[PDB]
Subunit: 484 residues, 3 copies
């Protein structure tokens, strides 16, 4: 009668890492990292994104003539913008607090255009101005959402306009000022000198004086246009007054939906899919809790780790008694209790320690996945030319948190793998020690892992041993008899 204790072995070829060892073969391994994407920019939960194409956000909002397909826009999930869009400010100029506006838009879904100041009310001015820098079929044109006020005859009466926000939600209004390149152009466009533009609401209050200087010709013109914006609250009023150099708005952008969104800097084109989260390189379809594609993602999907391998060893060592190696024969459990009697042999497994080990390993896996749900998520942000210190601060903070969490994940995986391998070895050793303890001195220890019984006993005796019910006082006299 022999009762050898061992561990199940198989033919898997999965390798894991450890603190003391590298490239170790195990039986069962669970991967936690996804490294594949389909390389397609496409829908999020059935709502298509907004594709600006060769357009900028400023060009979309001001109404660039080239960007005429964005005049009416349905609900969206995210915004796709090129890194250096070509169609931006048709007329050269600047946008004040552009990056703050982009940050505000990042969490704003569907807009709704409202005609707040029609073009027919300006009866004492000319509203048909345009420039060749914004040309359609060769003829001069202008922004679609704004009006350029100019002389009518030879006078420029004081321009007044007001809007009381009775729409129902918050509204965004954009206005501008014009800066000519000489006094002659100012006199030929507005018939006044020392003009002003005044805007006033319940919170904001500006009065801007046009600035005239000689400048290089950008897009053919030496003049510039300065654009500002504000957010108008419910039941609030905005007032406009100008003796000259006013670019009045015609539409305000009501905020309609709101939600979680973002702006993506991609060079791709919209295709037809349906994914759950989207990265600037492609979509992700996964159930694993980590990925290594791109830090900036939109939707609900795994955390980002800057690593190439994250494999958790949930099985045993693959080395083909337990002092020589594993057993290929066993298929039931994890720990070996070889059967060999006179009437027959067998390969029965142990149902006691196996369940405990499975529960412990599953608890460890779940704890590892659970400890990392509080990771750091990066959010896109834009910074101007004179804000390089802030940009460096943001970049360094994001990189530092990413490195910290990558280190944490890798160290946890390594330590858990080492603990798992040692845990299995200790479990097998403890089972062998318990068998030797219970059986006591009524056997000889062969050395390879099992005992040669000193007393002849049968199926009932040794399944009693397996159940931990061997009774030393029950059968020892014949053992001592055959001891001689």
């Amino acid at each position: 009668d022999q009762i050898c204790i061992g561990y199940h072995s198989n033919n898997s070829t999965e390798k894991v890492d450890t603190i003391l060892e590298r490239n170790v073969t195990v039986t069962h391994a669970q991967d936690l990292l996804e490294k594949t994407h389909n390389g397609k920019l496409c829908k999020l939960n059935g709502i298509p994104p907004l594709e600006l194409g060769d357009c900028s956000i400023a060009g979309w909002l001001l109404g660039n003539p080239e960007c005429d397909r964005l005049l009416t826009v349905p609900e969206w999930s995210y915004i796709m913008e090129k890194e250096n869009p070509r169609n931006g400010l048709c007329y050269p100029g600047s946008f004040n607090d552009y990056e703050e506006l982009k940050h505000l838009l990042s969490s704003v879904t569907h807009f709704e255009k409202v005609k707040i100041l029609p073009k027919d009310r300006w009866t004492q001015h000319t509203t048909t101005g345009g420039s060749r820098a914004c040309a359609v079929s060769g003829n001069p044109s202008f922004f679609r959402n704004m009006v350029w006020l100019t002389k009518k005859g030879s006078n420029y009466p004081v321009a007044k306009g007001s809007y009381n926000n009775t729409s129902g939600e918050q509204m965004l209004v954009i206005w501008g000022v014009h800066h000519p390149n000489d006094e002659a152009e100012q006199r030929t466009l507005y018939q006044n000198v020392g003009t002003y533009v005044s805007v006033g609401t319940s919170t904001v209050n500006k009065r801007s004086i046009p600035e005239i200087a000689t400048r290089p010709k950008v897009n053919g013109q030496g003049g510039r246009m300065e654009f500002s914006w504000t957010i108008l609250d419910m039941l609030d009023t905005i007032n406009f007054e100008s003796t000259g150099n006013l670019i009045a708005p015609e539409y305000g952008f009501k905020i309609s939906k709101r939600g979680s969104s973002g702006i993506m800097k991609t060079e791709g084109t919209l295709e037809n899919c349906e994914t759950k989260c989207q990265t600037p390189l492609g979509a992700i379809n996964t159930t694993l809790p980590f990925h290594n594609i791109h830090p900036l993602t939109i939707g609900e999907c795994p955390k980002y780790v800057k690593s190439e391998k994250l494999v958790l060893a949930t099985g045993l060592r693959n080395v083909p008694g337990f002092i020589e190696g594993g057993w290929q024969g066993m298929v039931d459990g994890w720990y070996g209790y070889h059967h060999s009697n006179d009437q027959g042999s067998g390969y029965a497994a142990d149902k006691e320690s196996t369940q405990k080990a499975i529960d412990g390993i599953t608890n460890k896996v779940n704890s590892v996945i659970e400890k990392m749900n509080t990771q750091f998520e990066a959010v896109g942000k834009e910074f101007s030319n004179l804000e390089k210190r802030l940009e460096n601060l943001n970049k360094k903070m994001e990189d530092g948190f990413l490195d910290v969490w990558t280190y944490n994940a890798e160290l946890l995986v390594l330590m858990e793998n080492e603990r798992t391998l040692d845990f299995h070895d200790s479990n097998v050793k403890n089972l062998y020690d318990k068998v030797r303890m219970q059986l006591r001195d009524n056997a000889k220890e062969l050395g390879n892992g099992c005992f040669e019984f000193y007393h002849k006993c049968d199926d009932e005796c040794m399944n009693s041993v397996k159940n931990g019910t061997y009774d030393y006082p029950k059968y020892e006299e014949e053992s001592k008899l055959n001891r001689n």
Copy 2:
């Protein structure tokens, strides 16, 4: 003649958590987290806070007529403010660099009001102006700490004012400019167009022009007042000069105490205590090194971890015998030590507890606890800050930084406690096994092990011999022949 080795079990029901097992019962556990507070706003080391109430900081410094109880305030320890104070700028307007002023005030204790420009020196102008927006008992009034200069008769001569800071410390000066809502109002109040307000110090150079615009009515007025500030260095001079639209200061605020304080956003009222540190929800009076009430605290008290439970296992496992050794469970009789060494002689018995291993294990566990506590004293402490409407990027940056550091440190603390529990339980098991192995080793082969954790001596010894075996002075050559003779039977 029979010795045994086991461990100690008791009646405790504290539960601890481990990286592999959940809700494991132990003998002794030490708590580290604190989850209670009195829910009262009260004193810090005997110094009461500055309770603004319904007033804002601008309303306190400018002298809003509703904030007349704060004209002279004593030394404070922190400032209590509401999220949306009702009484701020009674006359509508703005306040340039408000948040920088609040950041400066977060580290400034007791002020001292000094009359730098008396109201009576303006003998060529009118100083009795006021608005119904800041009205007391129906009649018009104005800010208590400022002067509104208007024309006297039909003339507004150039107004000049200087102050040389000989007060002995740094001074805070606040001025303003009035923006009317048409040209007629400007001519009715100052009798001039194209006016200016100029302020000049050694490091400050400004010249503001009025901005006339059509605006809605806030608190009944269409005009606005813009306020600015500066910090005057010692032995420095500040100059004022204006053709119109000047809201001149009358008092200057002198920094006197300095120290560590803060601005707390709360909606409660002051009460009677004496606390060591204060949170916006209450106060903590304990000695544990962790808490989970609110990230922003003023004073000296534990660090913040976003966890619900943090218990360290400083004891054995609790699996007592159902209905005599470590293979079955623990013994209730060991009240002297941690590692039991039950003995039983021919004439008597007992439950003596070992000493050499117990003291070493106690020292090790205490060192581990102290190391865990000491490794986490370099945590991240959150500091309150305020941001404007056009600074959302900066606010998001600050919020993300604080939240990320809190998450990192919470993860560190939780993982450390888990690993400590695992290794402590394994340590105790290994130490019991080591003691048993040492006893078996010294015993050599002069006993038959019963299996249940202990062996019955083949040689018949007495109290002295078995005490020597306990101490570790068992001599094989002295008592081997009789043992062999007995085992021959």
Copy 3:
């Protein structure tokens, strides 16, 4: 006839720390922290730094009369500046976006002065203006890189000037405006009131109005000067137009080399070295992976840990069979097989488990060094008086990352030391257990960590025992006969 099992002991006096016990004596230890510097400021890879002395960046760029030794400056590796420089803006005033310019300079090597607007083209104005705030040898002087245009005779014609950047790289241009203290001074200097200064590029549009006010006297003057700057792109032109209060530039600064550099706030001078890594306190010359001198560093050299000692335990516990302690007479390896045959004895050491332990320890050391090479590196930054919140944010972020990484390193070292000591003890115990298992009952376990054979066998048999080729059916009969006695 008897063998024994043990480990190696010697007379080293290195102490390591562990999570369960402090100041443990070990045989072999490795240090990972550098705590020494030469206290000198000196060259980085053969290129000397730029020594500003008692001058600020603004003083160097605007041409202060005191900083006359920096008119021509060769290539550099880093910039030396004092906390409170003496010679800065000789004429009192301000510098717009000073910290952004310093950040731009933080990654810019060699400049090249280009004379863009000569001093002789202003044939309708007086260019010889000067002040006693910047005085050389008593007489009034001015900035060397700037021109002060005043009236000539009794007229101030409109002043125009343009430059087209054909130099071949980006060029930095600085201009200024003047603020007098009274209307009389403005009339004396320029003959016009309500003057303007206008600057225009393809991305910059500005119109500045002089601000006249009464101010205290700084450096003996009540006026102020405000300076601004811009970066000119290639093939882009800049236009200047003013009716007064214009401080025109004469030189532009072409960015010629670019690279990695920095600004270091120090008070020392330049000595002679050839270092690879420089700190504001001194230079570092080491191959260890960590240091604790100063967070700010220029060059390539170890990471910063805010700690006092970091020692990794490589060897065994140094206490002088394996139960009573280690052996002092073993020199070959770590785990030994002290044997004593009938005709002799010895102190042989095993060569199979020793290699495994050596490989494991080396892998652990290399791994510990490898995981900690993605640390956080601090970069110097400057903030103004009204940017206190940003400064506090930056300081708190840098400090927090420093503490996080210090904690990580310390915990790693402590846990690894515990694991190493336990690993060595377990390995020795495993060796003894495997020998005892292979010997089967043909042994009399003495207790002291080793036993006496029950069968008399020679050197070859003992070698076979040590090599794992011990044969039970070879010499068991005589052993049983002996044990029956």
